[PDB]
Design a protein around this ligand. Structure first.
Ligand SMILES: [Mg+2]
Lengths: 50, 147, 322, 222
């Protein structure tokens, strides 16, 4: 079903895209995985420890 | 001239105090420690380098030695102030001295991950890869041919 | 040819929308494709002169952690939308924009009191929503031109700039570019093969001009490259400098010491503009100086002799070289 | 202020007179990477020079071979010739002859002393020889090319070899952090480079910078 949903968009079914190092400009071989993951932030922030 | 004037200057952080600080630690060692210090390596000596933010950078190898992940594990710092202690940290507990566990004569500095992957990828052999079958006048030539 | 090949030139500024623009540098010899592509992408993304908002002030509110009776969103949302708002200043480098609005409805960019030297890149950008008949907001908006991105924290310069309570600091994020895609292709050279045409599309705020951005980035690259186009062992440290210890503030007129204009004319009544000449002038020439009684003399004694100097000090080195 | 920062370079270390190490400091937040990468990519490929491309042993016309008189196979000879850096005068392409006999190492200095070329290291060993009654000769054609052009890309009887026009043998840039009185971190570039000796390394950096600037010249204002 995830493959079909990606096919709905114009995105690759493998979920992996040929990226490019912003420093050099040459592409990483072995197309890497990239998506949109949810990401939290925890109240162990640094300004409470240092 | 006065100590209170110097306290004020540090309070304001004049553009000279940073040069001063960079000077005063050019070789002055420092001690880093992990919260559960199970064995002798739990406390090591390094030379500090000034950075931004509030985090404490540390070499990945010794962080594999501290049994220290980066899940938010905290570390304590210490500054040996007397001359004996400075030279002692430089001579005994500096990371370039502890490279074998006192338990086993095995090397504690082991490249754990993310480099073994790197080197392993760098040393393999695709049967038919672009460039197969050439002759190279040396390693630097191969490096140039690759980049 | 074999050596000393040919240089490219910009041959298109094709814009598909107000922001999404395309340029086609051509022709690049070989390998220069990715070189200039990545280099220009890095320069453009890194540093372009933007003029986003930096300091706002709304008469009703005190701190951006408050609200206001009438506006649908909080002051925080208003500041975030403002940061989102883009504008193009032409004449000056910093400017102040007043936005007044009343009545029900959405307050967008067009509603602000525009000027001639200032131009809103897109007016439909919504700023806030007034949801009451007799609800109104007036706000001053400082917009300064800068390069890069500076947060609201470190931009503080003194301990009185924030003392005006209504001055809300919006962390400035001024960079006209948003993304820079690029790719090389086989240029239709009249007679050669495998020359490279570099197509660069920039998605931007619409503020900056595409060809202008390209040329500015190229100028930046050439300037930075000039460093080691003639590199050699160079060191700015020239130990044991030799300079006369005359204080330069003495070169300025006396009136530059933050005081009134009547006392200025008073020191213009003795024909004493210079501080480097008043330094050879003790208090033996003040009550004799025309109209120096209590008030103007109080100004003279306050704003001059407190700044670390003294009203008349003997020196033998003046003026080098006024 | 729309005016950037220019570096106050600190060191041109010239160890071995053919393997230099330049430092540059300070550079803006990202200009270290872009400058290092641009210089590296230009120096590697697009940096013209001169090197051998044609080898013709007038006794053996095959890469593979069983050619006596030398304890090295023809592959070793081609490898040695690949690095025979020769700086050429106004000529764009010239052939050289290396007829030699003797006992031991056929070295570069035995090349016929033409007036339109200059070897950079006559002390370069080319191929060791059978000690008696061995005189194998060969002609070698150079070309004024752009950079590294492999043989497989040139293959399309006359032997070929990996053309390496770029005078640079290796180059690597490494960017560290550097301090300005209150500034957090500015790029400090360190380029280590190693050339054929036909041009000094700093001279090669100068050449690459000039080529890139004269490429850029079509867009800048001042
Ligand atoms: Mg942990």
């Amino acid at each position: 079903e995830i493959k079909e949903l990606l096919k709905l968009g114009d995105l690759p079914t493998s979920g992996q895209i040929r990226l490019y190092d912003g420093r050099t400009g040459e592409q990483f071989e072995r197309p890497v995985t990239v998506g949109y993951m949810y990401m939290l932030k925890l109240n162990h922030l640094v300004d409470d420890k240092m | 001239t006065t100590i209170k004037a110097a306290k004020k200057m540090v309070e304001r952080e004049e553009a000279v105090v940073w040069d001063i600080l960079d000077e005063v630690i050019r070789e002055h060692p420092v001690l880093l420690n992990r919260a559960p210090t199970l064995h002798r390596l739990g406390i090591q000596a390094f030379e500090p380098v000034l950075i931004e933010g509030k985090a404490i950078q540390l070499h990945p190898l010794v962080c594999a030695a501290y049994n220290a992940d980066f899940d938010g594990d905290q570390m304590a710092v210490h500054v040996p102030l007397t001359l004996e202690a400075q030279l002692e940290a430089r001579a005994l507990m500096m990371s370039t001295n502890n490279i074998l566990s006192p338990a086993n004569g095995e090397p504690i500095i082991v490249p754990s991950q993310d480099v073994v992957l790197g080197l392993y990828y760098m040393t393999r052999d695709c049967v038919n890869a672009k460039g197969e079958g050439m002759v190279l006048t040396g390693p630097k030539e191969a490096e140039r041919l690759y980049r | 040819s074999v050596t000393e090949f040919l240089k490219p030139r910009l041959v298109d500024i094709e814009q598909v929308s107000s922001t999404h623009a395309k340029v086609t540098l051509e022709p690049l010899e070989r390998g220069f494709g990715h070189t200039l592509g990545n280099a220009l992408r890095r320069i453009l993304l890194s540093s372009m002169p933007g003029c986003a908002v930096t300091e706002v002030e709304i008469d009703g509110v005190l701190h951006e952690y408050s609200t206001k009776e009438g506006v649908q969103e909080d002051i925080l949302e208003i500041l975030l939308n403002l940061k989102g708002l883009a504008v193009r200043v032409q004449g000056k480098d910093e400017v102040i924009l007043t936005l007044n609005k009343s009545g029900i409805g959405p307050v967008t960019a067009a509603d602000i009191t525009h000027d001639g030297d200032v131009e809103i890149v897109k007016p439909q950008h919504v700023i806030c929503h007034l949801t009451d008949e007799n609800a109104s907001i007036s706000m001053r908006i400082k917009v300064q031109r800068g390069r890069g991105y500076v947060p609201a924290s470190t931009r503080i310069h003194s301990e009185e700039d924030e003392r005006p309570i209504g001055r809300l600091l919006v962390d400035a994020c001024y960079s006209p570019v948003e993304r820079i895609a690029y790719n090389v292709e086989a240029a239709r050279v009249e007679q050669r093969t495998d020359l490279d045409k570099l197509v660069i599309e920039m998605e931007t705020n619409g503020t900056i001009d595409p060809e202008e951005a390209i040329r500015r980035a190229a100028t930046i690259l050439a300037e930075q490259l000039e460093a080691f186009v003639d590199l050699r062992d160079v060191r700015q440290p020239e130990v044991k400098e030799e300079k006369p210890e005359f204080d330069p503030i003495l070169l300025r007129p006396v009136d530059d010491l933050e005081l009134t204009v009547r006392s200025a004319n008073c020191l213009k009544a003795e024909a004493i503009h210079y501080i480097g000449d008043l330094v050879q002038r003790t208090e033996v020439e003040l009550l004799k100086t025309p109209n120096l009684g209590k008030k103007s003399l109080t100004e003279i004694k306050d704003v001059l002799a407190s700044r670390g100097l003294s009203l008349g000090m003997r020196l033998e080195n003046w003026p080098p070289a006024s």
